Amino acid sequence: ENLWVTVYYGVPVWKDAETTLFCASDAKAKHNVWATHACVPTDPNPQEIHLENVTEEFNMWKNNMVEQMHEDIISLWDQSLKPCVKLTPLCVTLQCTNYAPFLINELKNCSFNMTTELRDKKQKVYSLFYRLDVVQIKEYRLINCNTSAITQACPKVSFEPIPIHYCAPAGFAILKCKDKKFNGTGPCPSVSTVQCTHGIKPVVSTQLLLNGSLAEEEVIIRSENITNNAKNILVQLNTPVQINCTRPNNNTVKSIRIGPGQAFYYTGDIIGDIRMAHCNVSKATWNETLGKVVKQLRKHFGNNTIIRFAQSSGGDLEVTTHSFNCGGEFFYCNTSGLFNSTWISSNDSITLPCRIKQIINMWQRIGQAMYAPPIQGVIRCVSNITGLILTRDGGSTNSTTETFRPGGGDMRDNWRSELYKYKVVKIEPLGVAPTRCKRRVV
Amino acid sequence: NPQEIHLENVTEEFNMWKNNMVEQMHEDIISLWDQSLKPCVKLTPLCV
Amino acid sequence: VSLGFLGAAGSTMGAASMTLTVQARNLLSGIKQLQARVLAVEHYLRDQQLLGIWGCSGKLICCTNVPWNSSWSNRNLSEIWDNMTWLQWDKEISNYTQIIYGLLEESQNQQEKNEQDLLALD
Amino acid sequence: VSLGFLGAAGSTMGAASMTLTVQARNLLSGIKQLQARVLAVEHYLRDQQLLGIWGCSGKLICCTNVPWNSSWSNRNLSEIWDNMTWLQWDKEISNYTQIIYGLLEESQNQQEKNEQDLLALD
Amino acid sequence: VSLGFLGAAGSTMGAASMTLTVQARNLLSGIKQLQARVLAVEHYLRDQQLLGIWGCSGKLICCTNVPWNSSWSNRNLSEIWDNMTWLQWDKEISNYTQIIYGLLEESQNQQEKNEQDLLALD
Numbered sequence: 001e002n003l004w005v006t007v008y009y010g011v012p013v014w015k016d017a018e019t020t021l022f023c024a025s026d027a028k029a030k031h032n033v034w035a036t037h038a039c040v041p042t043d044p045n046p047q048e049i050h051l052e053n054v055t056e057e058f059n060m061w062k063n064n065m066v067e068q069m070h071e072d073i074i075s076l077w078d079q080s081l082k083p084c085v086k087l088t089p090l091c092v093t094l095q096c097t098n099y100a101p102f103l104i105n106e107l108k109n110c111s112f113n114m115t116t117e118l119r120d121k122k123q124k125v126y127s128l129f130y131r132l133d134v135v136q137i138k139e140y141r142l143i144n145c146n147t148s149a150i151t152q153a154c155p156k157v158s159f160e161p162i163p164i165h166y167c168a169p170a171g172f173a174i175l176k177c178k179d180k181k182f183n184g185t186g187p188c189p190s191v192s193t194v195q196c197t198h199g200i201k202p203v204v205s206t207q208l209l210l211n212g213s214l215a216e217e218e219v220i221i222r223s224e225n226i227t228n229n230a231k232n233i234l235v236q237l238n239t240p241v242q243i244n245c246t247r248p249n250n251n252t253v254k255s256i257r258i259g260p261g262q263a264f265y266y267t268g269d270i271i272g273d274i275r276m277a278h279c280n281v282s283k284a285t286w287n288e289t290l291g292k293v294v295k296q297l298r299k300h301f302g303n304n305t306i307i308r309f310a311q312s313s314g315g316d317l318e319v320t321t322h323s324f325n326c327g328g329e330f331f332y333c334n335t336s337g338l339f340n341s342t343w344i345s346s347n348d349s350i351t352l353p354c355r356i357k358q359i360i361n362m363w364q365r366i367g368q369a370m371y372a373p374p375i376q377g378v379i380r381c382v383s384n385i386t387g388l389i390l391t392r393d394g395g396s397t398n399s400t401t402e403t404f405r406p407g408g409g410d411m412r413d414n415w416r417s418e419l420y421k422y423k424v425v426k427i428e429p430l431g432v433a434p435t436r437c438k439r440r441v442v
Numbered sequence: 443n444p445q446e447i448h449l450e451n452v453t454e455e456f457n458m459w460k461n462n463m464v465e466q467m468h469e470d471i472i473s474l475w476d477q478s479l480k481p482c483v484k485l486t487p488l489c490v
Numbered sequence: 491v492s493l494g495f496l497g498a499a500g501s502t503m504g505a506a507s508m509t510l511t512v513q514a515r516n517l518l519s520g521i522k523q524l525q526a527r528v529l530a531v532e533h534y535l536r537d538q539q540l541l542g543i544w545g546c547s548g549k550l551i552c553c554t555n556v557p558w559n560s561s562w563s564n565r566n567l568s569e570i571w572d573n574m575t576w577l578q579w580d581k582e583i584s585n586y587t588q589i590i591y592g593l594l595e596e597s598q599n600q601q602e603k604n605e606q607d608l609l610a611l612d
Numbered sequence: 613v614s615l616g617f618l619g620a621a622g623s624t625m626g627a628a629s630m631t632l633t634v635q636a637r638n639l640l641s642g643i644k645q646l647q648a649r650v651l652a653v654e655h656y657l658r659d660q661q662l663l664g665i666w667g668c669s670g671k672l673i674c675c676t677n678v679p680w681n682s683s684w685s686n687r688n689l690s691e692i693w694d695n696m697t698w699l700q701w702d703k704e705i706s707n708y709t710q711i712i713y714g715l716l717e718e719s720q721n722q723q724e725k726n727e728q729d730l731l732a733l734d
Numbered sequence: 735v736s737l738g739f740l741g742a743a744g745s746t747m748g749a750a751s752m753t754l755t756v757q758a759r760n761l762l763s764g765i766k767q768l769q770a771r772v773l774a775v776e777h778y779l780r781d782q783q784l785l786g787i788w789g790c791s792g793k794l795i796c797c798t799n800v801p802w803n804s805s806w807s808n809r810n811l812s813e814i815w816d817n818m819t820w821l822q823w824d825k826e827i828s829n830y831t832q833i834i835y836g837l838l839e840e841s842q843n844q845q846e847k848n849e850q851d852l853l854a855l856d
């Protein structure tokens with residue numbers, strides 16, 4: 001009946017905390033932007049420890065791991081651009097003609113002067129540009145030269161995203177929600193703890209999410225304010241749809257030296273046919289997937305309400321299109337074929353047009369732009385569509401109609417798609433509790 | 443004053459060829475060279 | 491049973507108190523990494539600092555001379571140790587941890603050592 | 613005699629065990645330097661961490677409750693302490709140090725404290 | 735009275751010795767900051783290192799086996815503890831602190847543990 005406080009060191013106690021995480025990935029054989037020269041190798045085996053009886057609240061939208069990853073991708077991009085060749089002298093006036101035998105189709109053959117390696121001497125060379133990179137005043141100029149400076153991506157580096165593990169330091173920990181039907185924030189009954197997350201591929205993408213992790217059981221709808229239209233809508237598929245993306249054009253590259261050491265790689269004349277880049281999607285599987293999504297969608301809008309799908313109708317060219325990277329080239333796909341539907345109460349694979357741009361400012365970056373060097377040979381990448389990003393048209397009249405447009409307003413949403421399950425906490429191992437014990441009297 | 447302490451009876455295997463102090467020093471001289479070049483005058487216009 | 495790091499986070503405080511070594515092991519073991527490693531040893535040394543001023547440096551558990559003021563919690567032994575988790579306990583005793591820590595260094599260690607000097611003075 | 617830091621690395625384990633303070637002193641005392649200093653305090657705190665979970669924080673030597681399993685080494689007192697160096701000993705006991713450390717925190721300290729709670733419970 | 739961090743810097747050594755916890759609390763708690771934080775934990779761990787080799791890790795005060803050589807200071811108990819401040823004392827004992835620290839690890843701890851092995855050897 002006489003109680004005295006007792007110190008316990010190493011008690012299972014944690015608090016919500018934001019700390020600086022770090023990278024981790026298994027060692028491979030080069031030089032990709034994300035791995036850099038060095039990122040700590042992963043443990044051969046991670047120890048994922050289930051925590052019985054433990055219920056913790058998760059919030060994917062107020063999560064700081066997202067903001068950290070966002071700034072990390074941006075900063076990594078700039079760290080990779082510094083040593084490469086900056087194309088400040090490439091803002092010379094371009095004398096351009098259309099290709100010339102265009103039956104039904106844009107890309108333009110241009111000629112221009114260029115500084116050689118000697119300052120004083122000049123060369124007249126020619127290059128082929130996809131007409132998104134140039135604008136007129138036949139005289140032309142690069143799109144970027146009035147907005148920002150430009151630098152050329154080094155040829156060696158690869159833009160092929162590899163799994164990255166985010167780790168928290170000792171004394172902190174990561175909680176992982178394993179609740180299958182987890183609707184995007186809330187209490188997670190089944191929670192396990194790890195020091196590092198699983199391999200998250202930093203896939204740079206717009207509208208549809210590519211090569212990601214699939215939700216088990218039902219497809220999952222994650223938002224921040226479901227009745228609100230301004231906030232985007234995250235979709236995680238249970239079945240991945242397969243999408244085959246190719247640039248058929250036989251691109252040949254030449255190397256012109258523009259200064260001491262500096263060497264620009266330019267798109268030579270195409271050899272063979274002129275075909276436009278495209279992406280195929282099995283209409284059957286995409287119709288099943290679209291069906292299953294609207295089944296889970298109607299759980300939030302009453303039950304036989306009219307759910308239609310329309311195209312993107314807002315914003316710049318770089319945001320309205322499914323932008324991504326494939327083999328080196330940057331694809332801007334028009335996704336009108338998929339989102340042209342209405343829902344109430346042979347192979348036939350859909351085909352999607354894709355244009356190509358070599359000058360790019362991703363993540364709303366105004367400032368130092370990048371020139372994607374031309375890629376030799378025909379390109380073909382097979383990818384998974386594991387998620388989606390949707391947006392409403394506005395306050396709908398509520399049980400009257402529901403029209404959906406795909407968006408990609410912000411790039412963090414892509415990190416939220418794979419970091420929805422993880423949360424960072426700090427261990428407070430000091431607990432004091434009363435027992436009927438006293439220390440030896442002085 | 444450094445304290446060089448003799449270790450009686452102690453026999454250790456050395457390998458000068460698999461030594462990492464060499465690789466460290468190598469990268470240090472290279473990196474130091476570049477750190478010293480940055481602030482100085484770059485003669486890009488001298489290729490006339 | 492050994493359930494692992496934080497294995498008994500959701501068990502009763504009495505059951506969890508048996509596996510303090512489990513949480514104790516992993517509790518200690520370029521720029522981002524380095525700053526993180528410094529933060530880790532900094533937090534660890536803070537807790538070891540508090541155990542120091544409470545005279546409990548080498549032990550995981552130690553008993554004190556501070557009596558339990560009933561205003562802190564009105565529960566008993568059985569209700570605390572066989573019905574609650576350390577998490578919800580730390581939440582209930584989140585208004586006093588500063589206060590209890592201050593009494594913990596002062597009431598005993600700030601008077602255990604003075605009496606120690608006056609006692610070993612012969 | 614004081615032979616200095618690591619002076620008895622090549623002496624018998626018994627002779628070397630007398631000068632543990634010698635190795636203990638120097639064991640703790642821009643970017644390259646800073647990263648090196650952090651690594652140093654990190655390793656030192658790791659060993660002090662292991663001494664902590666073995667209940668031996670303030671001492672250089674402490675005795676244990678773990679019996680010596682003869683599978684580890686078949687030598688005796690005289691053969692270990694008057695014929696071998698700590699180096700070749702650590703090489704012979706390099707398959708068990710992990711195992712012995714696990715038994716060292718669990719067999720005694722993970723049961724010394726439970727019995728301590730059940731004993732000081734009156 | 736609690737006067738605060740360094741409150742009794744200008745009081746007598748005896749009065750100041752009562753509030754060692756006060757100086758002990760705040761004694762532990764981008765590039766410039768990080769280098770400063772490392773320097774702080776480095777100095778703190780140095781002093782804790784010295785307390786370690788003197789067998790006084792968990793205590794603020796501990797008594798020793800080293801006798802007071804009168805060549806160090808010719809003062810007495812009353813003159814030291816009731817007439818001087820720790821500052822002017824540390825200035826008077828600034829020629830021996832190295833010497834006294836060496837005797838402090840060797841005279842006792844370097845012989846307390848050897849005798850401990852020869853005593854617990856049965």
Ligand SMILES: *[C@@H]1O[C@H](CO)[C@@H](O[C@@H]2O[C@H](CO)[C@@H](O[C@@H]3O[C@H](CO[C@H]4O[C@H](CO)[C@@H](O)[C@H](O)[C@@H]4O)[C@@H](O)[C@H](O[C@H]4O[C@H](CO)[C@@H](O)[C@H](O)[C@@H]4O[C@H]4O[C@H](CO)[C@@H](O)[C@H](O)[C@@H]4O[C@H]4O[C@H](CO)[C@@H](O)[C@H](O)[C@@H]4O)[C@@H]3O)[C@H](O)[C@H]2NC(C)=O)[C@H](O)[C@H]1NC(C)=O
Pocket residue numbers: 030156157158159160161203210211324325326327328375376377380381382383384
């Ligand atoms: C979703 O996930 C899927 C699954 O991972 C992704 O699909 C994969 O995408 C990969 C990258 O997008 C793609 O990888 C490429 O495959 C090409 C063909 O592979 C064939 O050869 C390899 C052996 O090398 C075989 O194992 C394989 O079976 C095939 O037969 C490779 O050629 C590609 O490597 C080249 O490109 C990368 C950049 O991506 C460079 O880093 C690399 O060095 C290669 O580039 C050299 O070779 C080309 C050849 O034309 C040259 O043009 C170029 O200039 C380079 O040449 C220089 O360097 C070499 C070497 O140093 C030197 O000798 C030479 O002289 C030059 O200096 C690349 O590996 C996968 O094939 C594809 N998976 C499948 C199953 O198809 C999908 O992308 C993901 N989704 C998204 C959105 O990312």
Ligand SMILES: *[C@@H]1O[C@H](CO)[C@@H](O[C@@H]2O[C@H](CO)[C@@H](O[C@@H]3O[C@H](CO)[C@@H](O)[C@H](O[C@H]4O[C@H](CO)[C@@H](O)[C@H](O)[C@@H]4O[C@H]4O[C@H](CO)[C@@H](O)[C@H](O)[C@@H]4O)[C@@H]3O)[C@H](O)[C@H]2NC(C)=O)[C@H](O)[C@H]1NC(C)=O
Pocket residue numbers: 135143146147
């Ligand atoms: C650097 O250069 C690049 C390329 O050279 C610039 O990118 C172009 O920027 C211009 C203008 O900044 C932009 O032209 C406008 O595009 C809009 C969207 O497509 C059009 O809606 C707009 O049309 C209106 O303005 C015209 C006059 O310029 C009118 O003739 C026309 O009728 C439109 O006016 C109607 O609408 C307005 C607004 O509602 C209303 O007030 C009027 O009363 C009227 O009803 C322009 O055509 C190009 O689209 C950009 N080019 C590309 C390829 O994207 C870049 O902006 C420059 N950098 C900087 C920093 O300025």
Ligand SMILES: *[C@@H]1O[C@H](CO)[C@@H](O[C@@H]2O[C@H](CO)[C@@H](O[C@@H]3O[C@H](CO)[C@@H](O)[C@H](O[C@H]4O[C@H](CO)[C@@H](O)[C@H](O)[C@@H]4O)[C@@H]3O)[C@H](O)[C@H]2NC(C)=O)[C@H](O)[C@H]1NC(C)=O
Pocket residue numbers: 097099100109110111126
């Ligand atoms: C895109 O534009 C670029 C411009 O830099 C263009 O490159 C040039 O195309 C012209 C096409 O006329 C090439 O000129 C030809 O060169 C060949 C070989 O030297 C000549 O034999 C040709 O002469 C014949 O055609 C004339 C037409 O009037 C006749 O008068 C004459 O009698 C001959 O029958 C002609 O002069 C020129 O060589 C290239 N330049 C380079 C550097 O290669 C490119 O071809 C355009 N893209 C496409 C798809 O056409």
Ligand SMILES: *[C@@H]1O[C@H](CO)[C@@H](O[C@@H]2O[C@H](CO)[C@@H](O[C@@H]3O[C@H](CO)[C@@H](O)[C@H](O[C@H]4O[C@H](CO)[C@@H](O)[C@H](O)[C@@H]4O)[C@@H]3O)[C@H](O)[C@H]2NC(C)=O)[C@H](O)[C@H]1NC(C)=O
Pocket residue numbers: 250251252271377378
């Ligand atoms: C995109 O366009 C380019 C054109 O710039 C094209 O490159 C050409 O591809 C073919 C291969 O399909 C190359 O032909 C080979 O070249 C090598 C090296 O010179 C030769 O050794 C080869 O000889 C073999 O084949 C002969 C057939 O008669 C045999 O007689 C001989 O014994 C050998 O077995 C062969 O000629 C050609 O050199 C390149 N051209 C250039 C300029 O690089 C490329 O194929 C197109 N891309 C794609 C993906 O198709």
Ligand SMILES: *[C@@H]1O[C@H](CO)[C@@H](O[C@@H]2O[C@H](CO)[C@@H](O)[C@H](O)[C@H]2NC(C)=O)[C@H](O)[C@H]1NC(C)=O
Pocket residue numbers: 183184185186187222223224225226
């Ligand atoms: C996911 O679904 C859960 C239902 O289990 C939502 O949680 C409720 O949200 C409403 C507001 O929409 C709150 O008033 C309730 O307090 C919540 N209920 C419980 C039991 O926590 C959650 O909001 C949904 N998430 C999203 C993004 O819509």
Ligand SMILES: *[C@@H]1O[C@H](CO)[C@@H](O[C@@H]2O[C@H](CO)[C@@H](O)[C@H](O)[C@H]2NC(C)=O)[C@H](O)[C@H]1NC(C)=O
Pocket residue numbers: 211212240383384
């Ligand atoms: C794209 O989706 C396919 C399934 O449609 C994935 O193929 C499966 O990959 C898993 C590994 O995660 C294997 O266990 C399965 O056996 C594969 N399926 C079949 C039918 O063989 C493929 O990995 C996905 N691609 C990604 C995520 O890049």
Ligand SMILES: *[C@@H]1O[C@H](CO)[C@@H](O[C@@H]2O[C@H](CO)[C@@H](O)[C@H](O)[C@H]2NC(C)=O)[C@H](O)[C@H]1NC(C)=O
Pocket residue numbers: 242243244280281282347349382
């Ligand atoms: C994307 O490409 C893959 C492989 O190139 C296609 O898979 C082929 O599908 C047909 C049946 O439709 C099979 O006969 C082939 O055996 C498959 N190929 C392989 C290598 O297994 C897939 O159908 C393509 N997707 C689309 C939408 O066209």
Ligand SMILES: *[C@@H]1O[C@H](CO)[C@@H](O[C@@H]2O[C@H](CO)[C@@H](O)[C@H](O)[C@H]2NC(C)=O)[C@H](O)[C@H]1NC(C)=O
Pocket residue numbers: 320334335336337
């Ligand atoms: C993507 O493709 C669609 C075709 O479905 C294009 O939509 C047309 O846009 C024009 C105005 O630009 C309208 O007058 C037509 O009625 C639309 N077509 C249909 C069938 O409705 C769309 O412009 C393309 N998007 C981009 C960015 O090129």
Ligand SMILES: *[C@@H]1O[C@H](CO)[C@@H](O)[C@H](O)[C@H]1NC(C)=O
Pocket residue numbers: 095111112113124
């Ligand atoms: C190259 O420079 C000359 C001036 O010496 C100019 O006449 C010519 O038009 C330039 N080349 C092109 C393709 O415009």
Ligand SMILES: *[C@@H]1O[C@H](CO)[C@@H](O)[C@H](O)[C@H]1NC(C)=O
Pocket residue numbers: 225227228
């Ligand atoms: C979010 O939804 C609630 C639900 O009624 C609404 O009251 C609130 O205004 C919405 N917030 C925003 C920012 O639109």
Ligand SMILES: *[C@@H]1O[C@H](CO)[C@@H](O)[C@H](O)[C@H]1NC(C)=O
Pocket residue numbers: 302303
């Ligand atoms: C909507 O349909 C689902 C599935 O059949 C059913 O569980 C639910 O009760 C329906 N909602 C209403 C309001 O009728």
Ligand SMILES: *[C@@H]1O[C@H](CO)[C@@H](O)[C@H](O)[C@H]1NC(C)=O
Pocket residue numbers: 340341
């Ligand atoms: C796509 O939209 C257009 C415009 O209304 C329409 O003519 C076409 O039938 C739609 N395609 C499909 C597959 O519904």
Ligand SMILES: *[C@@H]1O[C@H](CO)[C@@H](O)[C@H](O)[C@H]1NC(C)=O
Pocket residue numbers: 559560561
């Ligand atoms: C216990 O808490 C009460 C708050 O009502 C306070 O007045 C009292 O001084 C405390 N008692 C002790 C012994 O600290």
Ligand SMILES: *[C@@H]1O[C@H](CO)[C@@H](O)[C@H](O)[C@H]1NC(C)=O
Pocket residue numbers: 581582583584585
């Ligand atoms: C902590 O203090 C606040 C305000 O003084 C009070 O609302 C809260 O209930 C207190 N916590 C507990 C566990 O009593």
Ligand SMILES: *[C@@H]1O[C@H](CO)[C@@H](O)[C@H](O)[C@H]1NC(C)=O
Pocket residue numbers: 681682683
């Ligand atoms: C000693 O080692 C043997 C290996 O043969 C093992 O089977 C046994 O359990 C160990 N004994 C103890 C008491 O740990």
Ligand SMILES: *[C@@H]1O[C@H](CO)[C@@H](O)[C@H](O)[C@H]1NC(C)=O
Pocket residue numbers: 703704705706707
């Ligand atoms: C350690 O284990 C390996 C393989 O199990 C064995 O070859 C080696 O002899 C062992 N070490 C000792 C000292 O027995």
